[PDB]
Point group: D2
Chain length 472, copies 4
């Protein structure tokens, strides 16, 4: 168990249920469930399949002899057919009617779509929880004033909750894309035959178009889908796999930016990721870096799907089978692992207001030179061009004292001792109040959380209790 | 003009109007139009901006002195500010109120969104035309029976129009994704200020939240958008650029598969791309290969956008400006060039029914061995296992005569001279009729074209007349 | 074992020894071996480490208590430190000197480089075998004349062995790149300390530069390397990981082209991949498609490494740890799986000369029209422009009979019954001899195999016996 | 000139000579030069080509009538053939022997290889200059002590020049890879004919293998190459294009990391990029961000080349022509633009020692707790476990005063007033001297610059004078 390379997604990062969502046992159970639905539908459509045969497949659907299946696959060189005969050996009564009229893609593609849809159902509450936990921090810190940063340089002040709403906005689009995949984009393949023309099922029903349509119509309903593709080749359109990985890779870009921002702010000592207390105020963003690492892998996992779809030859070419075994589950496992890390970091995100105030104060004298300029022109009868060049000379020499000599910012005292800036000497004691410079930061948080966030996660307000633990 | 490297997208492949959609003249006109809308909105919101100033900006919006702008940019090292002062020099009356309270991203990001939206408006009718031209070929050849191919090997017969509907289904999803970008995903940035808090506009309106909201509300309306982002940083969420390139790269995967299929079938002499007659029945798929080449470049153009978005630091970092100048226009130009090639190839696609019939006939004796087996068991009282092994021995030796000795397929005469297959000797003269093996291929074309294709392109039935000429 | 998602590379495609090359047991054994070499080197450099301590680490290097290590990691949240204390508990005598003066990257990075180098040593003989098996087929079929294909259209005749040499040329460059990685590019990290300055080891040796240099010099020798990096940060330059995945992705591009070519020629019935006989002359390129699928995944696995290296912050940032656990082993496992498939397909590649002759004959009358034109001008006193237009009219109508009416090529009989082409009527009986049109195809195979292939694999002529079995 | 989209690489970022290296005029001149060399070689090999014909091609090689060529291409739909007839119209004497026996890839592929090789000759001195300028800064600041950063958190002190050597090491590998491409990997295609068998040239020389070999041997020499491929299809192995873009993309990863590091350190006010003085000590890393943006585009430009090579069908398929027109020149233009930015930033890189000392001092009391622990055990007879827990309690509460209360680090005064730490009270006044903690940082710079950098750029010591100006 330790001598072989263990993929870290399955063993170290992704959740238990997502790993089991793509296990081989889960897959063959779906294969056997589809053969059951096929026989149930064929029987109720006029075909002679006794319910004694159907209940025999039902009785031993969950007991798969993988020892026989592996031996069958080595001798038949066909994985689906190996499990056809394995299920047939376990079901002697129902053996002649198993997989009747269908091809291996009937169980292959339809069970994939079931696993892919169930994978989204696993991811969706975790995206919603990430939104919920960040939305509570954004509301909690909607007035916590801090320095905004452009080019990683100090910019005009904002609030920490206002910055968090910037992160949530991206998560709102990922949730929207994932819901669209599950509710609209992903359809059922159904029973289309070898090349999508349903010729085999047309033979079985003696050329009755209506029964063949209803067979496909019923199977789509039994498997939990709303509609099926109508003009497939042998498979469902592989462009669907692009849509899935694109949406999942899109989550990776969001998680990577959020956690890079958290890593950046951690170096300014303004925030810190949570951690197991098993030092508390002097450590590294270990979890945010891991999320960035896993998000970057997820970010690029889509590059091999697009080129795979572009070389699907005509009705079907098998050079998509192996790569889909890898990319699709690992894309879900990485997305699951990133959202697990993101919710944990969002839940226990620590902030340090006094450092935010200290960093804000040391840069504020430079950030107010323009509203001081407006004050001199509007209230001091100062010439715009003349007051600007003088403020520049004072700012230029004060900025030199900061970087060249390592001194503290004394720009405000430079203007105080300057006769020219007499009209603003009275406002200088309180000109560095960060509370009147944040514009509508607080109000934007309120409207955004109330109007855009709350309705977007409304249907998940019953799945938001589960906290995200990081044991490793 | 020939000494410098000329990007082939702008000179050789993409359409005139898409190239001009991203020209610098078009961009600065948008920049000046946004400054006009800003002044028009600020004036009607209570700010003192005389309409004499507004109409002066209107009079010389379309006349840009690029000689001054380049000189300003070299001395200011800022492209937007260079065009602020250039527009200010041309507008002495309105100079003090140009770009009032806004940052360079007010014109930078909003004009990009206008150009990106207009780029989709250029692409959408071309996608619809590609669907329309393929839909007419699919209806025209809904009964043209031909060999379907899996693993590039002969499979059960289908029809050429049924295979074309497989291509159209992918184009229906690309049209759907592009419409969703333009109608829903792409929003306006509006007037958000330096860090998205609208602090500057709050200063100008003396802290009136209502006027600041209406300023953003009116600008969103004037620029032709329905809503704006509410919690930006300095820019609109760059995840939008991922959504755009992902949808455009998705078109590349579709075009590449369609044209690879056309290239494959051209080697079997069953189809041939159109060509300028300026030999007619002996040439190379030059246009389909070019479309594949341009589609593959478009397919992967999205890989640099996702990593760019993932490293956007906090409120804004300028390492997305240069790459967006390249990737976004070239993604549109390549998509435009592929759809131009795809419509041209779809319009003049030639088919050769006699080759389709000949290729069908040479492979049909192998494709009917299973329905012959069913005939022997159902009508000849033959044992399934015993009739299967005998059909295999006849098929094995006939397949050896094909590849080893280069002879023609004589499997049907092998069964005719076999006493065992007496019950099927009467059906052997007509057992190779491809008309009863295509299942529901014809009916699937009808339903698909009537129910899914026709409504999807309904709003474009006025833009479908323009044919796609390939001069190069 | 079947309820969890099993990565198909480790379970289905890659070889046993490559899977075990990256197992966790193998890794910790390397970690313990490096701590041994560290103590052995420190002891022989003047530090007080008794050989009783060293042999205690030696006695229980191969017995790893993973139960303790997992419990230590959950409480310490550090995988290396968990195995420091686990090895320390198993080695009470040597516990105080384990990991002395080094950081976790001493075992982390150095053991990775050992595993990466050993991975290349696994791949190199398999690349050589792929070259050897293809070189034997190329020599075997150096005179087997067949149709060359451009734009997938028939071109001038070549030979099958000459086409195989085209494949081998790409494999010669992949072998060359892999040897360069192992012999030159990959260096040792050594003992550099926390930030690469060796400050800790300088403290231990009381500031003796010479002992610190020799410590790094000896460790590089003991671990089987020739040199070490001199100016690292905390890790070895991650650009090395780009070089590795680029070379491995390069193998994927080669394997994909070779096996796509085999898939294409299989549809013309001129070749066929090997297969387990457990129909023989009527089947699908199942193995070549799987190789294409795995090669395409390997082709793109490099895209996440380049962006990881580009965001390594300053001396070290941990957002490369998780993705390196995935990409580096899976890149080796996929490369190993592709070369396994490629050698198997190369060993048992079947050719069909009579189909090659038949396909050649049906297209030869079009491929000789230009040398007939030269014959008419050089020997028949024909005007070039006048003889060209007449040959075109005969070729145009013959090409129409092929595609429009499905008839056989009767161009040679069109020229025979034409009075104009009297000077070439005598050569017409034998003008379709493919043996005088292949140029230097045979001689090129001889020189290439003797001068370029044989020396390139000379050092592997003892590893070429092992055949490649595909059980699945 | 402003109405059409102008690719920013050609107009804004890349150098003049690199843009002209891929211009169409430069290409056709190479096409005409190859036809000249072909005639010169054929004439001196026994073929009847009078030097009057050869000098006529020589006289008007540089005067290309692009008006005729564009008209020829529109009517012939073939760009090479259009310039064959255009050159033929300008050369009536030599018209019958132009392009004799060769195919369009003779000029197409060989001129590409000449342009690609000349592109490397443009890049190589710029890589060397980047190394030279960084090596001078590394030597200049080999003793400038500063804080090293892991996880973007403060780590053990190093020196600025020692950190720069970390950047140079990556550039040494890119220079090494580029030299290997130009001197070894890139070969000549030569005169191989339509499918690489040289059948046409064998016809012209009446089947003389020796003259055909010498024709290819001489052309390889005349064009400035050392050897040619021997077993091509119609083109040179497109894997070469992968090797080129991989090496160029590798430069992008290096430039992106260097300039991200410069962007990070600029936010700590320890360095600052150069800038046109046309504020000086308060601005944004505009140039480093642009380099990151262009490097990221270059980083991923390789993703479309690998998939293009993987789908080259058999002897040749034309779906690589269009994408090679785009990717190969833009990869060189982006690499050229990044190295231009990198050298400019390296030349004028500003450092601020007092900020480095201030940042170092505020974090040093935490970075010395472990060597204080060693001092207490080695010199104060303190128990290791007992002295560690006490140092932790003092460090834990001091770290809380930093982040919670925003106070300054008073850990050293906490130990001074603690009776337990009496043995280290005397060393406390000077325990924060950063000069004894940097290990071998200074010596590593000396050895690295003298032994690895100086020999690597030895052949470029005549191309190092040219400074890199950034006008935009
Ligand atoms: N048309 C087909 N549809 C589904 N599976 C197939 C088809 N043809 C072959 N297979 C099987 O699919 C498996 C290929 O899986 P992979 O290892 O991913 O290539 C093998 O067991 C094949 O026998
Ligand atoms: N915050 C900003 N928003 C918009 N443009 C900016 C900003 N800061 C600098 N610029 C300008 O944007 C241009 C950068 O373009 P690029 O060449 O794509 O990097 C330069 O002219 C800069 O002066
Ligand atoms: N500087 C470092 N070098 C090596 N490993 C570290 C370092 N810092 C933390 N770690 C550990 O590395 C592991 C991260 O692995 P991953 O799950 O790939 O992020 C965790 O056990 C961390 O405690
Ligand atoms: N075998 C060939 N080798 C070189 N060029 C060709 C070949 N076949 C066609 N062409 C021409 O190459 C050009 C294709 O360029 P692109 O626009 O990049 O597809 C057209 O002018 C074609 O006529």
């Amino acid at each position: 168990e330790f001598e072989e390379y263990r993929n870290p997604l399955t063993k170290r990062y992704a959740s238990r249920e997502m790993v089991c969502n793509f296990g081989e046992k889960r897959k063959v159970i779906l294969w056997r469930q589809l053969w059951i639905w096929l026989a149930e539908t064929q029987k109720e459509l006029g075909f002679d399949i006794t319910d004694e045969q159907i209940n025999e497949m039902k009785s031993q659907r969950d007991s798969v002899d993988f020892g026989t299946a592996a031996a069958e696959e080595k001798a038949r060189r066909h994985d689906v057919m190996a499990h056809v005969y394995t299920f047939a050996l376990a079901c002697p009564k129902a053996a002649p009617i198993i997989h009747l009229g269908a091809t291996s893609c009937f169980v292959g593609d339809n069970a994939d779509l079931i696993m892919l849809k169930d994978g989204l159902n696993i991811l969706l509450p975790k995206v919603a929880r990430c939104i919920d936990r960040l939305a509570k921090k954004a509301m909690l810190h909607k007035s916590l004033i801090c320095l905004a940063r452009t080019h990683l340089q100090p910019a005009q002040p904002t609030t920490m909750g206002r910055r968090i709403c910037m992160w949530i906005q991206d998560l709102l689009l990922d949730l929207e894309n994932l819901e669209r995949l599950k509710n609209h984009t992903i359809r059922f393949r159904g029973a289309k035959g070898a090349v999508g023309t349903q010729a085999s099922f047309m033979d079985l029903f003696q050329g009755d178009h209506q029964k063949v349509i209803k067979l496909d119509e019923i199977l789509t309903k039994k498997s939990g889908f709303q509609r099926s593709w109508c003009v497939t080749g042998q498979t469902y359109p592989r462009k669907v796999d692009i849509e899935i990985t694109n949406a999942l890779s899109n989550i990776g870009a969001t998680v990577h930016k959020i956690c890079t921002d958290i890593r950046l702010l951690s170096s300014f000592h303004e925030v810190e990721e949570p951690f197991e207390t098993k030092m508390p105020y002097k450590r590294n963003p270990i979890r945010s870096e891991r999320a960035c690492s896993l998000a970057r892998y997820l970010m690029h996992i889509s590059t091999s799907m697009v080129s795979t779809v572009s070389v699907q030859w005509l009705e079907r070419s098998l050079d998509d089978s192996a790569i889909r075994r890898i990319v699709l589950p690992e894309a879900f496992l990485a997305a699951d692992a990133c959202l697990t890390l993101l919710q944990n970091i969002a839940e226990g995100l620590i902030v340090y207001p006094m450092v935010m105030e200290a960093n804000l104060n040391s840069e504020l004298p430079f950030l107010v030179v323009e509203r001081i300029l407006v004050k001199m022109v509007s209230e001091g009868a100062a010439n715009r061009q003349e007051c600007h060049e003088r403020l520049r000379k004072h700012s230029h020499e004060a900025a030199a004292e900061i970087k060249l000599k390592g001194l503290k910012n004394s720009l405000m005292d430079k203007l105080l001792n300057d006769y020219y800036f007499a009209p603003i000497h009275s406002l200088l004691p309180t000109v560095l109040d960060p509370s009147y410079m944040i514009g509508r930061a607080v109000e934007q948080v309120e409207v955004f959380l109330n109007t855009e966030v709350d309705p977007a996660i409304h249907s998940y307000k019953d799945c938001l209790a589960l906290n995200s633990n990081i044991t490793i």
